[PDB]
Symmetry: C2
Subunit: 384 residues, 2 copies
């Protein structure tokens, strides 16, 4: 934006630098360059007097664009302030030499000529200095950090949180797209085998399929992704508080105003994702354990009935062949053994507390009948 | 010894490992070793902090200052150190995403379980060590950086500068205590000490001194922000003591400043006010005497009647010449009242003289005006 000023800046540091590291008073040369600096200072101030520099923007966040504008050519504005803040000490260097060369015997009218010029630079120095150092420099630093907290920190966390919500959804699409649509039939032997696998290894997803091995793994990465995000939503409050008050710039009111809304917006979105994952955990764990136990209770109740029917038949028809009576006994033996293996493994399984109150009771209703029937089974297989 | 030196054995190795971890494609058994190595190294690093404690409650101590300096010496390296360990969680997430992309049901899954347990094993040690250590350590480095800036580069500088002003202030007085007319030059002027044309130089040395003050005085009201910021802003309870130390430093420097201010204010009276005062004391004294000179001259003319033309003409020319000086003097003195250089006190003496001269000047003037009539 300040094309005119860019052409001047290089000579400015060159002259200031020359003055900065000169020990000889060339009264003629020093006068020339000091006068130049004075005129150029005024020029820079007039161009920077709200032409293309900070003014009250309390009206709208259009200032965001002006901050972005600063950062584009921030390399240059930093260069300007560094030179101008060097001025006061540069002039002080010049002043010592004047005092050192200011012998009583000579008139030293040169000292007057230059001190008037020096103090002439200082008045404009002090006028231009206060806005650039106090406001412009701070505005670059504030806008630099504000872009960090908004773009690098807040925007990134929203991206992360959204991707966690999609992974949340991506998981459900795998569950629905599987051999087990819902309520999967199993064999009591296999139910034992799989239930017993889980006994041996917060809960984990049961293995209905090679797909469940996948869902389990995918869900584990999802569950581990959240804490860093949740850390950063308790840890961003400090960085948000610091800039919100510490900066004490004119437009800070508007910035903190905006950031508070962005944080509130993303915190809502965060709580949604947390809830979605909570709801998913119940589906992929509690529900799965529920249906498995419905499955158990179905087959358990049936094979318990089968056993009761066999007992009835043996007592009613003890007059039949030993081929028949031996097959009847071997069946009752085989069936009884599994029923107790089932109730044992059930009763050694932690997940029973997850179970819906209804289905847990069905298992318990079956349990009660089996404590009555097993002795009646056992006394018969005693004689065999 | 240095605890940093123990960690400095293998910091490059930790960075190297994560560098290749960032950009690894389809590495299985190799990755298992790499990850495991990092885990063990991290625990070793956690133990080094325990042996020589970078984060510790030294708040009770005033040896904090020593501890700052120690950190800043090797701070260059601690940034390299901090940067890699903070990168761990996101680096492993990339690995996990690569692992998740493998899929392949049971076969890939079995290896994946060995890996995730290893990865989450890295993270417990990363997160435990990483968060507590580096949070406080990074703050402490930044706090130490700023604290030395505000104490050495800002506060110590201003003390040096203030003292040099007091030295110059003193240096001037030694020259004042160790060493013509300005006749109408007074009238030309009509606050410049043009009293000693030779030592008009000393005033210019005072002028630069008077000009040096405000930047210093600016910096003593603009340091309060930087002092207030660092005082409360720092999260560490350790700041409380640093705040106390800076408050004591500031009050010490502020006393020295007010002394230097007073010293220069006292000096200004001695160079500018006193010299102006004596000039006008001197003029009033001359004025009184030349007024007297006139009265005697008037008396001589009147008392001894007949005198030589040579004598009567000399007497008259003196009376004329003396009267003109008296008014030139009154004129100058009363114009010093406008610039307000003349003390209100010595003003009264001039006024007392003025009154006697308004009674004599007619007696002077009648003599001269008869001579003026003659043509």
């Amino acid at each position: 934006l300040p094309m005119e000023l860019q052409n001047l800046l290089p000579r400015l540091e060159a002259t200031v630098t020359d003055l900065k590291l000169a020990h000889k008073l060339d009264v003629v040369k020093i006068r020339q360059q000091l006068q130049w600096i004075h005129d150029t200072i005024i020029i820079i101030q007039s161009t920077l007097a709200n032409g293309l520099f900070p003014s009250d923007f309390k009206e709208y966040q259009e200032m965001h664009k002006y901050m972005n504008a600063i950062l584009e050519r921030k390399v240059e504005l930093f260069k300007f302030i560094n030179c101008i803040n060097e001025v006061e000490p540069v002039l002080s260097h010049i002043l010592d030499l004047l005092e050192e060369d200011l012998s009583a015997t000579p008139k030293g009218n040169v000292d007057f000529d230059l001190l008037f010029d020096l103090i002439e630079n200082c008045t404009h120095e002090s006028n231009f200095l206060t806005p650039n150092l106090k406001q412009l420099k701070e505005c670059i630093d504030a806008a630099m950090e504000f872009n960090e907290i908004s773009r690098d920190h807040m925007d990134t966390l929203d991206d992360l949180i959204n991707k966690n919500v999609e992974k949340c959804f991506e998981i459900q699409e795998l569950k629905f797209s599987s051999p087990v649509r819902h309520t999967p039939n199993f064999t009591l032997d296999q139910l034992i085998k799989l239930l017993s696998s889980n006994n041996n290894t917060e809960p984990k997803i049961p293995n209905f399929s090679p797909v469940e091995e996948s869902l389990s793994r995918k869900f584990l990465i999802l569950k581990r992704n959240i804490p860093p995000i949740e850390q950063s939503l308790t840890e961003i409050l400090p960085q948000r508080i610091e800039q919100f008050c510490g900066r004490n710039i004119i437009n800070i009111n508007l910035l903190a105003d905006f950031l508070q809304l962005k944080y509130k917006r993303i915190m809502k979105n965060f709580r949604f994702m947390m809830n979605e994952i909570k709801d998913l955990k119940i589906e992929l764990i509690d529900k799965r354990w529920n249906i498995l136990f419905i499955n158990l209770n179905n087959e358990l109740e049936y094979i318990i009935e089968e056993v009761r029917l066999l007992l009835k038949k043996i007592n009613e028809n003890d007059d039949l062949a030993q081929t028949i009576k031996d097959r009847f006994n071997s069946q009752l033996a085989k069936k009884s053994k599994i029923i107790t293996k089932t109730f044992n493994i059930i009763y050694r399984a932690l997940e029973f507390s997850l179970l819906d109150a209804g289905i847990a009771l069905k298992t318990n209703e079956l349990a009660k009948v089996w404590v009555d029937l097993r002795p009646k089974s056992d006394e018969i297989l005693l004689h065999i």
